């Protein structure tokens, strides 16, 4: 009923990424992060900035042509944390409350058949 | 001092007396 695209939300710690693209992926449209919509470096990942970034994203989305979208939220992944960051659910909340539509949302965090030694060495990051 | 460091302490000490004695062979 609507026009569909991809939301794709990389929500790590220390920042949260949102950017809508073509459903094929190649051509992307409107981005902006949390590190953008406030300056404080340490406040780069708080749900507040994430919301404000979902605001800017929704604004251009409904300014170019996308009326709907599917989200693929995503943590750092790889050999790192693997657990969803602070400002993705808030970005989700803010982009649904925007006025855009929503349909089907799977997670795409890279999970390995494990390996490549994790950083920080055997004795652990100790502090 | 930690035992392992003391074990290392004398390893060094030994390798030295190994040197000095060698000047005299």
């Amino acid at each position: 009923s609507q026009v569909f695209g991809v939301a794709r939300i990389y929500a790590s710690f220390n920042d949260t990424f949102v950017h809508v693209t073509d459903l094929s992926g190649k051509e992307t449209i409107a981005r902006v992060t949390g590190g953008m919509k406030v300056k404080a470096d340490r406040d780069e990942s708080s749900p507040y900035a994430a919301m404000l970034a979902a605001q800017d994203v929704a604004a251009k989305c409904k300014e170019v042509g996308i009326t709907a979208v599917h989200v693929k939220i995503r943590a750092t992944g790889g050999t790192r944390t693997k657990t969803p960051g602070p400002g993705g659910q808030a970005a989700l909340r803010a982009l649904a409350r925007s006025g855009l539509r929503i349909g089907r949302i799977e997670d795409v965090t890279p999970v390995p058949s494990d390996s490549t030694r994790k950083k920080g060495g055997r004795r652990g990051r100790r502090l | 001092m930690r035992a392992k460091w003391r074990k290392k302490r004398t390893r060094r000490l030994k390798r030295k007396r190994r040197k000095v004695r060698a000047r005299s062979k």
């Binding site: 569909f4 991809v6 094929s24 190649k26 799977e106 | -």
Partner: protein, 214 residues
């Protein structure tokens, strides 16, 4: 001082034959300029869409599909096939403790000579009166299940390209025959092809490609 959206050409994506809505989605390119154009440059992309999103029913909510774009004809961009996946959450939902994950795979060819590697996964189930709390099989068990699973897969392929293989996957007949050959060894549950990743296409051949459309 430009804003490429007052410059972008706009598009819509059409599915192939053996599904539901061929009208799948929309996209953006660039005006077919002399020297780098909207045609040959791209279009030949791929599209991730749940087949429950393109079949209609939800007894299909997992099982994802990759449509690849081969031929185009102005505003009407036609697609074929790139493979099939699984929703990451659905898989994670079957990998319960106290049971066996059995997994097997095989690389094989069709008539219209596409080469593919297809997958297959099953888990042992408790006997519906079992008392012991886990239920694992016995490796000699497992080995049997794989050799049979593979015996079944190498059969079901080399049908009429993916085209009929496609038409074989969608109603999951493979899943049941598996269960059939198997139940003479061990229980088992879920049992899906899970993944199938294509990987070698023959030649363009504008005939058969177009032959899936109308």
């Amino acid at each position: 001082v430009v804003d490429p959206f007052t410059r972008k050409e706009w598009f819509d994506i059409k599915a192939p034959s053996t599904f539901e809505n061929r009208n799948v989605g929309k996209t953006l390119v660039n005006k077919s300029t002399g020297l780098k154009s909207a045609s040959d440059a791209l279009k030949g992309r791929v599209v991730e869409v749940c087949l429950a999103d393109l079949q209609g029913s939800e007894d299909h909510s997992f099982r994802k599909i990759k449509l690849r774009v081969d031929e185009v004809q102005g505003k009407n961009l036609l697609t074929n096939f790139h493979g099939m996946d699984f929703t990451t959450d659905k898989l994670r939902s079957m990998v319960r403790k106290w049971q066996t994950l059995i997994e097997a795979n095989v690389t094989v060819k069709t008539s219209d000579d596409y080469v593919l590697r297809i997958f297959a996964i099953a888990f042992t189930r408790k006997q519906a009166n079992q008392v012991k709390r886990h239920s694992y099989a016995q490796s000699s068990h497992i080995r049997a299940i794989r050799k049979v699973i593979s015996e079944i897969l190498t059969k079901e392929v080399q049908g009429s390209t993916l085209a009929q293989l496609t038409s074989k996957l969608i109603p999951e007949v493979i899943n049941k025959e598996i269960e059939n050959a198997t139940k003479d060894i061990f229980p088992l549950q879920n049992i899906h092809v899970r993944k199938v990743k294509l990987l070698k296409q023959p030649k363009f051949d504008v005939g058969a490609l177009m032959a899936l459309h109308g």
